[PDB]
Design a binder for this molecule. Structure first.
Ligand SMILES: Nc1ncnc2c1ncn2[C@@H]1O[C@H](COP(=O)(O)OP(=O)(O)O)[C@@H](O)[C@H]1O
Ligand SMILES: NC(=[NH2+])NCCC[C@H](N)C(=O)O
Ligand SMILES: [Mg+2]
Length: 356
């Protein structure tokens, strides 16, 4: 499997992880010497090694998780490492558990979490999808990036109603518009250090782009972290409308683009945090009393299985006291359950804010 160069780097990375006293990644926690010795010589059919799985967490010691799947096979070949990390992250998703069958459920039941708008600025739900027949970022070729982009853009051009829109490739995109789309919370960052270290930004920006409707309430990211991110968002608190629109989009898109699903893992994605439902439902929310210390808010949010991010996304700070709060877990519960877990948590945090 792994050649001499890769093995040398692996031994060094394992030592670096062990030596990192301030590291608390799931990677460091679960890559025991035993698991390491068991996996270090392995290599997938596409040639992905344990290095291709763990390098981002070796380079970024402050990672929360620290691993990615370079191909679909990696989830299985390196299951002794993925499985306990997946169980830890998704709370209660055990080594022999299977993620439930897709179910958006009772979309109608979701509420406006803040009609007046004293707390919630905007509401967003995204899913991730991988295209059948293509591996994840570290194993994609330039030809594949462009080929996937051509499929996606030509496909989405047939979408109608609220889903009708336009594909905007990053290649040739106005620099001014690109930064404004990022600042306005619509377009992905041009990578980050976690993705860079995973060899996840190769050939940038070939094959990368964003589809969106004119009012930017429905968007599709092409070839960022995942092949597709399918996104519904709007100002205000109407989680019901947001999720209704996302569900319609997902249903229409899969009629046109075959997606990778796994009997145990659900829908496949590049990071193990995004498997299963792949759902991240979030609000941009102001909670001035509760969020005086980010730590106290994080404690309280954690009790409801919520995750706190900054205004520009993960690894950013809250600007003007606007926090991104979302369901943390995505596996071992249905799409409906994931959004309901977010909704129930947000309502609880608003009650807490009001009462303290
Ligand atoms: N409720 C929300 N309203 C507006 N923008 C949001 C919301 N949630 C996330 N975002 C935006 O999503 C973008 C991606 O952030 P990130 O943390 O990388 O999440 P993901 O990749 O899961 O979409 C950022 O531009 C961020 O500002
Ligand atoms: N975009 C994501 N997949 N975020 C979750 C993992 C991010 C990064 N690899 C870490 O371990 O902290
Ligand atoms: Mg992201």
């Amino acid at each position: 499997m792994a050649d001499a160069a890769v093995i040398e780097k692996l031994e060094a990375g394992f030592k670096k992880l062990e030596a990192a006293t301030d590291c608390k990644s799931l990677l460091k926690k679960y890559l025991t010497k035993e698991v390491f010795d068991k996996l270090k010589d392995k290599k997938t059919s596409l040639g992905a090694t344990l290095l291709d799985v763990i390098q981002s967490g070796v380079e970024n010691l402050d990672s929360g998780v620290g691993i990615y799947a370079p191909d679909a096979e990696a989830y299985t070949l390196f299951a002794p490492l993925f499985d306990p990390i997946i169980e830890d992250y998704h709370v209660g998703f055990k080594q022999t558990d299977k993620h439930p069958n897709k179910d958006f459920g009772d979309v109608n039941s979701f509420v406006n979490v803040d009609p007046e708008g004293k707390f919630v600025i905007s509401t967003r739900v995204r899913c991730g999808r991988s295209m059948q027949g293509y591996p994840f970022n570290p194993c994609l070729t330039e030809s594949q990036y462009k080929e996937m982009e051509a499929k996606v853009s030509s496909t989405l051009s047939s979408l109608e109603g609220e889903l009708k829109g336009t594909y905007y490739p990053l290649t040739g995109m106005s620099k001014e518009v690109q930064q404004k789309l990022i600042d306005d919370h619509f377009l992905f960052k041009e990578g980050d250090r976690f993705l860079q270290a995973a060899n996840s930004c190769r050939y940038w920006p070939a094959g990368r782009g964003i589809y969106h409707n004119d009012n930017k309430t429905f968007l599709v990211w092409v070839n960022e972290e995942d092949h597709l991110r399918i996104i519904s968002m709007q100002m205000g608190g109407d989680l019901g409308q947001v999720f209704r629109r996302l569900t319609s989009a997902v249903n229409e898109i899969e009629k046109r683009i075959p997606f990778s699903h796994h009997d145990r893992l659900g829908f496949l994605t590049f990071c193990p945090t995004n498997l299963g439902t792949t759902v991240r439902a979030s609000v941009h929310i102001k909670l001035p009393k509760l969020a005086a210390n980010r730590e106290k808010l994080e404690e309280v949010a954690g009790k409801y299985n919520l995750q706190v991010r900054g205004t520009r996304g993960e690894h950013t700070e809250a600007e003007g006291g606007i926090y991104d709060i979302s369901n943390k877990r995505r596996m071992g519960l249905t799409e409906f359950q994931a959004v309901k877990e977010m909704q129930d948590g947000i309502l609880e945090l608003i009650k807490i804010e009001k009462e303290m």
